[PDB]
Amino acid sequence: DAWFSCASNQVAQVLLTLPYSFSQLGMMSGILFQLFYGLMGSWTAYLISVLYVEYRTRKEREHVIQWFEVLDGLLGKHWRNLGLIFNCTFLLFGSVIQLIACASNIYYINDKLDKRTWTYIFGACCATTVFIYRIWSFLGLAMTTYTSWYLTIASLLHGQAEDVKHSGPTTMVLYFTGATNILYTFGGHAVTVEIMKAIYLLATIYVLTLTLPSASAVYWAFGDKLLTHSNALSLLPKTGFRDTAVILMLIHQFITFGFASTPLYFVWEKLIGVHKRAMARLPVVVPIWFLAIIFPFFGPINSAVGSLLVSFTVYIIPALAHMLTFAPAPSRENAVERPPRVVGGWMGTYCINIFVVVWVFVVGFGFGGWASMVNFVRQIDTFGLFTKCYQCP
Template identity: 30%
Template sequence: MAEGDVKAASATKLAGGLDTEAEVNIEDFRGDSATDDISRQAMMKSLVDIEQKEEPASWNGILRKGWSGNGGSLSDAWLTSACAQIGQVMLALPHAISLMGLRAACVIIPCYTLFSMWTMHLLNALYVEYKARKMKEGSWVPGRAVQYYDVAGYLVGRWAGAFTLLITVISLFSTSIAQIVATSTGFYYIVPGVNKLYWALVWGGILTFFFSLIPSFRHFRVFNIIGLVGTAFTAVFIIVSAGKTGLQGEAFYLGPKNMQSFFLGTNIAQNAWGGHTMSFEVMDAMFRPSRYDSTYPLSYLFTYFVTVPHSILTQLAWPLSNAQQGNVFGVVPNNAARDVSIILMVIHECIAYAIYITPVFFMWEKLIGTHYKTNWIRLPSRLPVAFVVWLIALLFPFYDTINAIMGAFGNGFTAFVFPAVYHMWVYRSAEARAACLKPPPRWIGGWTGAFLINAMIASYFLTFGVGFGIWAALKNLVDNINKYSVFANCYQCADIVKTNSLTG
């Protein structure tokens, strides 16, 4: 069946489903009939969640349905979001706190977290708007992955879709590259006799030929659980190690060395709380995507417990080493628990690679026409993209620099600027606001409060997160290239060898 026939058949099926099953007239879900809060919310659930019939009622339902495959429940969304938010950031955030200074970090991290949760609400509202409009016009196609640039291009304009696509690819590529660099660095800590470039070749191959072939976000359940166990163990290990070493109170008052260091640190923090680039794919994989913004903040509870305490204690216990090392494993003592932690984090980084590279695969599949093909055709067609990521990881193996670039280029836009600006644009008219299926909560001041918050977030992150952040990240990249050259055999290896001599 041709793609156009698939779309037409799907649209007809959905339109029929709306009238017969949900008892909602598809022509009446916007306009005056949508202004009442209660009816609007009911219609929203009927429209956006109409396809989903298989949601498990609880964790018991997950157990009955198995640990992998077809996972689209709220619990699955929580697992994926929590797993994606941590990743390599858990290893880089202690160094970011050193770059910013602990006093500044204690203000910046909570603020960035609140901003992140708000902008995720905005993205969820835009997804609901996008899907509802698509269903009304009969062009919604179940099974076609909805992505960031799809929503931006449809709701805002083609120029917004094209620019969003560019920034999203940069962000997702950078995150995927960081996972390869992180895995090679982790194994160098365990086996320093083999250089990092070799480990990057090995792990890049493993990630390319195995983790690139996971079909969609409904197949990550078991991987996410394993990844979260690893991050929890690592957090406990570092906290215990810091307690044994002893805390230096004067480290609290250490500030950034210069402006470049400060913005490199804020870039990494921005990256830590800005994993929005793959949010639409996670929403789209859910049984009830309209509820994603209520699940996302819960993932932050876990993220906070496994990233912030250990990062602060690392700065207080080893301030001098933390200032020099972009990876926390270069700071903590060398012992068996550290090696176990490294192995668990390598597993987690493999999972994070799959989570962040999958949206790029979807884009590539749509471009070359394999997105609707069977898996034995679709999945191998992704390999050229994975090879490019692998090559760039070998070319620029600068861990902290990659995280900084990712925060400035990618997450500054996708997590903060785009959601705020696009939301204001889509709902700029009174008619659009009246017909909104997911309006801002009243406790922030309704639409007036939402627009003020959006304008503040867009202005701040466009100036400091993107502007100064890109300057600091690119300057750091040039400095590293001049010092280590491209295809560096062993970036910061001398410091790692020195760290391996420490026991505890």
């Protein structure tokens, strides 16, 4: 069940926008960033797992565990608050992106209504999730594998046009936007759901089979035209398989929205003390619906969220927590699970954590963050806020 979870927790959302980042980065840089960020995501997932195990063992020596609870148990209350805020904001923006993707996908099969009306309808539809897993874990694997291997097969059949030009990396802003989009792509394994290793690393290598051939085949066939089309289904010819992929993606995004709204809603209920009940969750829906309408961007929003929220939520905070919790010598002496010998032991783990923090801050948040924000403002200037249809001819 663990493998099924990580397969489509956060890969389906970014699968359609991957060719956009590939075109922004070039083929070589895109592949290299994909591999590097897959490795980094697997490492951060391992760090989170070991932290969870350590916290559980410490609690047992003297419900469902949550990341903020782990931080509270290990480091302190300040880290608890930091992790709670970051996780809540990340979930809110993930829901926003899910609604945006739902509207963008549903537009293509039925283009009678502009994207704005579609997001209105979908926001109204998901407002009913307030009134509202293991079995669906397998299903999500099946609905994302079809899309990943439909973009590859369909794109190759389409072939290269007589005038497609692969510009490659032309501006630093676009390059770093694509890099941050990949970073966001590989921030799904760190999701704390489905927590009781090299065996679990086989989940990320599988995710690399969905993302590598799909992004390389779509970008290769359509050249640099992907820059103006964040959603890869716009360029592909209309066919029954495209409609099947759109329907599967819509179902996946709707179910993921419903499932990932539960923790944010629980946190809101605890904060407000409500613990008839639909009214309490209404004010939480309002920010999500408004954000999707005002910023219907499909790829730029992914890049901005990955740069600002994910970079700290799933990359820097886990590394800092692992470094600080095990900093005392007694903590390492009584460690429940020693680091694997293949990664250099304690010295290697600390060096890797330092490198991860430095990288995700200098280029994962500074260069990447600046580039993503500049691109977001550029799209705001181009299509304007409350745009009727984002990237629609």
